[PDB]
Amino acid sequence: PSRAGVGYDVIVIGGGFAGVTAAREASRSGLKTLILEGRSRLGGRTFTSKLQNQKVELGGTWVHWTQPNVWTEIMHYGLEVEETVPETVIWVTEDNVKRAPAAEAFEIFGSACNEYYKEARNIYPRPFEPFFERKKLQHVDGLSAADYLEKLPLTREQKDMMDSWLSGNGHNYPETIAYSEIMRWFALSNFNMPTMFDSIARYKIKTGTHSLLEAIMADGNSEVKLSTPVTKVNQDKDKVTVTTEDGVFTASAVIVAVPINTLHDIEYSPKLSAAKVDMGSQRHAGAGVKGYIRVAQNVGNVMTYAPARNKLTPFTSVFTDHVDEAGTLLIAFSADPKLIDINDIKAVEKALQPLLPGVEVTASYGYDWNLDPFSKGTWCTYRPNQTTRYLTELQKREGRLFFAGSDMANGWRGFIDGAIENGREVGHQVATYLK
Numbered sequence: 001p002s003r004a005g006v007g008y009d010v011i012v013i014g015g016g017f018a019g020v021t022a023a024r025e026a027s028r029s030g031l032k033t034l035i036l037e038g039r040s041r042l043g044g045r046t047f048t049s050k051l052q053n054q055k056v057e058l059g060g061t062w063v064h065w066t067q068p069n070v071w072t073e074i075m076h077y078g079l080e081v082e083e084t085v086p087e088t089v090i091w092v093t094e095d096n097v098k099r100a101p102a103a104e105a106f107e108i109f110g111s112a113c114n115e116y117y118k119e120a121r122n123i124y125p126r127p128f129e130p131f132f133e134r135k136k137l138q139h140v141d142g143l144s145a146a147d148y149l150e151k152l153p154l155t156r157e158q159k160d161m162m163d164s165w166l167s168g169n170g171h172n173y174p175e176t177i178a179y180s181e182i183m184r185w186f187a188l189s190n191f192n193m194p195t196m197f198d199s200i201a202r203y204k205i206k207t208g209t210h211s212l213l214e215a216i217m218a219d220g221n222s223e224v225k226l227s228t229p230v231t232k233v234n235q236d237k238d239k240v241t242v243t244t245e246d247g248v249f250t251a252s253a254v255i256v257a258v259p260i261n262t263l264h265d266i267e268y269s270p271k272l273s274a275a276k277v278d279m280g281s282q283r284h285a286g287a288g289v290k291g292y293i294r295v296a297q298n299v300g301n302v303m304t305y306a307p308a309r310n311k312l313t314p315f316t317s318v319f320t321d322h323v324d325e326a327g328t329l330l331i332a333f334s335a336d337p338k339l340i341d342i343n344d345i346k347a348v349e350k351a352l353q354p355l356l357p358g359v360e361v362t363a364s365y366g367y368d369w370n371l372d373p374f375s376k377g378t379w380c381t382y383r384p385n386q387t388t389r390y391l392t393e394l395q396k397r398e399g400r401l402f403f404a405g406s407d408m409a410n411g412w413r414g415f416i417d418g419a420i421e422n423g424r425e426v427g428h429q430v431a432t433y434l435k
């Protein structure tokens with residue numbers, strides 16, 4: 001390392017895409033760098049695994065060239081993408097089920113989106129520059145997704161389809177999710193609903209998200225310690241002392257790249273600013289269910305919508321991954337784990353009956369990101385007021401403590417792309433700070 005009295009120039013706490021991108025950035029600047037990771041693996045809220053004979057993504061999955069950082073890195077390393085999924089759309093409204101060819105359902109849904117998203121260009125004309133229209137964003141940031149929904153002249157059917165979509169975006173009940181965050185997704189999709197569909201659930205890395213993570217790691221020169229939860233971070237004038245459950249490590253600068261819902265799992269000295277305290281106490285809105293379901297039947301390429309609260313089914317959305325000769329692989333989301341145990345095959349089979357009657361579930365699994373102490377929640381969509389109250393102060397360095405993550409990115413906050421974007425600029429600021 002450069003200076004005396006430290007073990008490292010840079011310690012990165014957390015080895016998701018954000019921490020790994022920051023550690024590549026720091027170590028390729030010639031800084032002696034260590035990643036401290038609490039789990040037995042790198043990847044964080046991305047986790048490539050297996051379900052039956054299928055390679056699956058238990059967390060973060062889909063990517064697009066609307067996402068500058070992850071698309072840059074995909075091409076950087078010569079990786080390929082393939083496609084997930086629609087023929088028919090099934091939706092619940094007033095606790096009744098309808099189905100129709102996809103284009104007909106999209107006539108109703110798109111007309112609703114036309115109304116729901118009409119202010120997005122006014123609030124985020126530069127989506128990677130959150131506060132370019134600070135005052136207009138401030139005017140609406142108090143609104144939840146449900147609040148804005150109740151202001152619109154839509155049919156109940158249109159409102160029910162939006163409820164499904166909005167709940168799907170934030171992974172929670174619509175009243176918990178910032179309306180402005182809904183506008184952000186649309187703005188990042190170039191104010192075009194088909195581009196939004198393509199960006200958030202279509203293309204995936206052929207060799208898995210883990211192949212990109214390892215490419216980034218292998219391009220750096222950083223050390224790694226796995227299965228090493230950090231318990232204390234202590235900063236003085238000259239260095240940072242990081243206490244873990246298996247060793248003490250010092251650095252001239254530390255990048256805290258943990259999910260914001262786990263900020264209070266670490267003990268900090270001096271204490272952190274009110275923005276970190278409040279965000280870590282309030283959490284972002286992402287707290288739902290994601291699972292993979294195997295049904296014996298061939299149901300084709302379906303996509304389903306249902307409100308977060310309905311009498312028929314706990315799933316806000318179910319859609320075909322691919323059809324097979326063992327049946328259909330479905331992907332299913334719910335707003336609330338209390339509504340369905342995604343690993344209970346019988347519970348799940350009953351949950352699907354209103355949408356795909358007679359279907360037989362042979363396998364069902366979802367990773368529990370909510371109870372995993374190293375995530376405590378799913379992807380990050382802010383709650384009302386959080387963007388304008390906390391984003392900038394959340395991003396800020398405090399002495400020798402820097403902060404990184406998709407949970408605080410400027411652009412595709414809540415996505416793999418946001419983690420890489422934020423990790424790369426924070427790692428560069430650290431390199432600059434260390435001169």
Ligand SMILES: Cc1cc2nc3c(=O)[nH]c(=O)nc-3n(C[C@H](O)[C@H](O)[C@H](O)COP(=O)(O)OP(=O)(O)OC[C@H]3O[C@@H](n4cnc5c(N)ncnc54)[C@H](O)[C@@H]3O)c2cc1C
Pocket residue numbers: 013014015016017018019036037038039041042043044045046058059060061062063200228229230231257258259262265266290369374375377378379380404405406407414415416417419
């Ligand atoms: C179910 C689900 C599906 C998703 N699907 C998509 C998708 O399709 N497309 C998309 O773009 N994004 C998706 N996302 C979002 C994406 O997965 C995340 O935004 C991203 O992976 C997180 O990057 P990060 O490095 O900022 O955070 P994390 O991956 O959470 O990095 C945090 C890391 O730090 C570690 N850590 C935490 N606390 C400590 C501690 N005290 N000591 C040591 N280590 C610690 C954690 O174990 C973890 O390895 C999804 C998220 C979820 C939950």
